[PDB]
């Protein structure tokens, strides 16, 4: 009925004429995601990636790798003997490591504002899992299990070579031995490993059993929206090798006049960039390649130069500056000085009058991201702000740094799957253009001054 | 490089200066969705609903119910004897009915522009399914299977009472007998019913096995984006009883001046509507109720009147009229006569300059819809165009009629799950307001006139 619009987010909230003594209060249950499976099954991989996605879409998440807790308690690794079921002392340390991790999980979900906590450990026994349930139960946390099952020696072998042997545990080992020691380590967990059994013992557990690297899934009783998304997400990511290329439209006319937004076409240099891009793609010699653009003339003209089928996406359109479209930063500061200042102090959440915020872009780009995960080779020709959002997702950058990532014109960012994330390579196509990057940039409201 | 922007959709396409003799060409493989399971398992329900969703998001889909083909070939039903495995003649008719349906499936996917075809029949035998694969294989159609398994007599019994007994097959029967005849009919299919076996015989088939009304899922090798969505969709819909209420913000100031868009607050009547709405909600006496609004002041003020926690969604914001925001239809016709005319001849695809189209709303509302499916009781306070889109989804209205659906101010649309769809009830809260509904509305370009 009677409200006021927040200055940064432009959100309508009710005016709280806090009486004499303003009462605050503060601070949807948090979720503990429990990874399950033998080592070298991709649990850490899934953990890190899922967390990357969730934080990007706005759900604060953190991974709690029990392994790191162990490396912290036991300075240097020696061999798999540490993991033998008969190693009574090591068992105490391992148990202590897991409980210490949960301790931090409690502090995260109950005292640091986190919503999701990924408990990354083998958690291969009903006994370990029951303990976690109890823990969750007493702290009022929902529990969701993700088990990875893979009995393909080629896969396990490969997984070991990609992330295991180069672990700090094997700092003083050659491939031959690290590989041999890890295999023995896995054997240690095999005897008491009790996979999840939803059609029986684990009927009441909320879980997803990822089988044969995503070939098949077994989902049991999803509880909420959050558990709905993850499941959706896990069923769309793959591990096939491929490359993702990201770049902006060749320089446009508004770029030259320092004008934001609009729908201007390519400048002579922008067109030059287009051919260069065509040459670059040709040289990459990719068997197949999808090309995506926004619906703004700028990106489509660039795509045309490629002579390849491309698909337009309205979601890739540049951020909408509202009443500031087509205006220069100078004109914005002069006409909307307060709006200008507000954006500089909170560039991620700031929303343009009748326009958008970087936050809006993320919600808007979520489906572009979901498709990128499903695809193989893809070239995305877009815009500065948009590019920053996608890049933030792939490179796991925070919301605070997202609106400042450097995404120059005429430059292609080549992204490749490496280890637990994405490797990025920058390739400038050698065509001049303007630079549209802008970095971040009291006494009277106090006595004495 | 050199393109032109389409007048209606504002989409940048390359100029095709069709040479002397313009060549056209024309017209992603189509998909045949194969339903599997004993009768009264919700296959038709799933079929119709999935098709409702798909067409709404833009993927042309149609259901091919073999049952209707049979009722068409055999004027009147008599009893389950028709379905006995020893009824050699009926078997010929049934086979003929299925093949006739596929025939229409071919014509749909290959000659009518359809993308998805839902083959709705029990398809309970490996033999029937293998036939469908062959069919698909020879027409270059992908094949996806959805099997519904339910061994809960209470469920089957209930399903029978809700959609079976009231079938035209039982026009001359009382509940007692229709129920008894249907049970015998189901027995007929039980002997040769071979459920899907993904971990064996059906390993290479793309399928999802819905178990215990969604309690559990078994997904096997999703092939594309399309099979990704459906799966996601099926895992989010439920059949619990609940109600969805939809209405617009109480009348606002711009409403009074005949002004579109903007972010004006409630008028005195709009506020009156707010209290009325509060009274209405109270009288509905719902155990729980979620309230959703847009981020425009109008809907939030309305929600405030309820004194209930509500969640804002940027996706629910009214359609964006671009450079026409805050303008009157009169001012639009006068200032942008051509834009005005263009919108009237293609109201669904038309996009406002630097604004949106009803088509954009759908893509934008997809996640609102997905959440509505996951929830129980929900009150959505929004806007005319937005409301029309949601209503179009629930009432299965076409894109052509969506921008004209009647969604008056101060009126609540109560939606309830009934049969295979949604029942709608309109409740006007008895508070005056303006009417913002607008219906649809050569010689010189020819010789002689
Ligand atoms: N669902 C999966 N099944 C098997 N291997 C996978 C899966 N997802 C990812 N991987 C692979 O596993 C490796 C990462 O394994 P890691 O996460 O360290 O295993 P773990 O934590 O289970 O000991 C990568 O090479 C990755 O490609
Ligand atoms: N996954 C499901 N399992 C069991 N019953 C369901 C499911 N989905 C919907 N239903 C119920 O089934 C009924 C509709 O059944 P119908 O589609 O005619 O069955 P069928 O086509 O299998 O003979 C409705 O009462 C609906 O609530
Ligand atoms: O509590 P458990 O089940 O042992 O799981 C965590 C353990 O797994 C290890 C299994 O090798 O994996 P990780 O690679 O995740 O570090 C150990 O470091 C750690 O002790
Ligand atoms: O080809 P089949 O496997 O018999 O499936 C379609 C058949 O199922 C029926 C099963 O009762 O169901 P429906 O309610 O879908 O009409 C019959 O009308 C029809 O003959
Ligand atoms: O996020 P920033 O640093 O304000 O830059 C935003 C601008 O970048 C551009 O893509 C190019 O200036 C504009 O269209 C957009 O308004
Ligand atoms: O779809 P229509 O019939 O053009 O009406 C659209 C308009 O409806 C409103 O919600 C009210 O006029 C406007 O904000 C919006 O522009």
From Swiss-Prot, chains A, B:
Active site as annotated: 120, 150, 249, 318
CDD domains membership: HP_PGM_like (cd07067)
Region (Fructose-2,6-bisphosphatase): 241-449
GO cellular component: cytosol; nucleoplasm
Disulphide-bonded residues: none
Annotated ATP binding sites: 37-45, 159-164, 340-343, 384-388, 420
Reactions mediated catalytically: beta-D-fructose 2,6-bisphosphate + H2O = beta-D-fructose 6-phosphate + phosphate; beta-D-fructose 6-phosphate + ATP = beta-D-fructose 2,6-bisphosphate + ADP + H(+)
Phosphoserine PTM positions: 449
Tissue: Ubiquitous.
UniProt: beta-D-fructose 2,6-bisphosphate binding residues: 248, 255, 261, 329, 343, 347, 358, 384, 388
Any one GO BP annotation for this protein: glial cell differentiation
Record PROSITE patterns: PG_MUTASE
Spans annotated as 6-phosphofructo-2-kinase: 1-240
Signal peptide: none
Annotated SUPFAM superfamilies: P-loop containing nucleoside triphosphate hydrolases, Phosphoglycerate mutase-like
Pfam families noted in UniProt: 6PF2K, His_Phos_1
Effect after changing residue 164 to R/A/N: Loss of activity
Site (Transition state stabilizer): 248, 255, 383
Keywords from the UniProt entry: ATP-binding, Hydrolase, Kinase, Multifunctional enzyme, Nucleotide-binding, Phosphoprotein, Transferase
Example of a GO MF term: 6-phosphofructo-2-kinase activity
The enzyme's E.C. designation: 2.7.1.105, 3.1.3.46
Protein's UniProt keywords contain Amino-acid biosynthesis: no
Subunit details: Homodimer. Forms a heterodimer with PFKFB2.
Family per similarity comment: In the C-terminal section; belongs to the phosphoglycerate mutase family.
PANTHER family linked: 6-PHOSPHOFRUCTO-2-KINASE/FRUCTOSE-2,6-BISPHOSPHATASE, 6-PHOSPHOFRUCTO-2-KINASE_FRUCTOSE-2,6-BISPHOSPHATASE 3
Name of the featured protein: 6-phosphofructo-2-kinase/fructose-2,6-bisphosphatase 3
Organism, scientific name: Homo sapiens (Human)
């Amino acid at each position: 009925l009677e409200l006021t619009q927040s200055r940064v987010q432009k959100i309508w909230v009710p005016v709280d004429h806090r009486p004499s003594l303003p009462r605050s209060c503060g601070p949807n249950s948090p979720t503990v995601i429990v990874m399950v499976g033998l080592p070298a099954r991709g649990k850490t991989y899934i953990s890190k990636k899922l967390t990357r996605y969730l934080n990007w879409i706005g759900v604060p998440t953190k991974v709690f790798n029990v392994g790191e807790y162990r490396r912290e308690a036991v300075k240097q690794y020696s061999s798999y003997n540490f993991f033998r079921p008969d190693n009574e002392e090591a068992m105490k340390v391992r148990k202590q490591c897991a409980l210490a991790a949960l301790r931090d999980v409690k502090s995260y979900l109950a005292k640091e504002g986190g919503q999701i906590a990924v408990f990354d450990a083998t958690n291969t026994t009903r006994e370990r899992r029951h303990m976690i349930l109890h823990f969750a139960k007493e702290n009022d946390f929902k529990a969701f299990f993700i088990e990875s099952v893979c009995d393909d020696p080629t896969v396990v072998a490969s997984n070991i070579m990609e992330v295991k042997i180069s672990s700090p545990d094997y700092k003083d080992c050659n491939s031959a031995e690290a590989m041999d020691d890890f295999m023995k380590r896995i054997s240690c967990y095999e005897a008491s490993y009790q996979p999840l059994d939803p059609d029986k013992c684990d009927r009441d557990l909320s879980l997803i059993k990822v089988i044969d690297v995503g070939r098949r899934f077994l989902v049991n009783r999803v509880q909420d929206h959050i558990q709905s998304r993850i499941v959706y997400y896990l069923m769309n990511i793959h591990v096939q090798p491929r490359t993702i290329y990201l770049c902006r439209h060749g320089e446009n006319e508004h770029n030259l006049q320092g004008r934001i937004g609009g729908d201007s076409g390519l400048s002579s240099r922008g067109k030059k960039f287009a051919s260069a891009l065509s040459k670059f793609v040709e040289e990459q010699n990719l068997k197949d390649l999808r090309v995506w653009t926004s619906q703004l003339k700028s990106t489509i003209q660039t795509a045309e130069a490629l002579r390849l089928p491309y698909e337009q996406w309205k979601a890739l359109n540049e951020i909408d500056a509202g009443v500031c479209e087509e205006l220069t930063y100078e004109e914005i500061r002069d006409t909307y000085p307060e709006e200008y200042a507000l954006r500089e102090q909170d560039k991620y959440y700031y929303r343009y009058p009748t326009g958008e915020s970087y936050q809006d872009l993320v919600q808007r780009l979520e489906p572009v991201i979901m498709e990128l995960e499903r695809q193989e080779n893809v070239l995305v020709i877009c815009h500065q702000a948009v590019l920053r959002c996608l890049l933030a997702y792939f490179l796991d950058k925070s919301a605070e740094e997202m609106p400042y990532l450097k995404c120059p014109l005429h430059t292609v960012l080549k992204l490749t799957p490496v280890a637990y994330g994405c490797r990025v390579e920058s390739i400038y196509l050698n065509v001049e253009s303007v630079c549209t990057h802008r970095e971040r940039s009291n006494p009277l409201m106090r006595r004495n001054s």
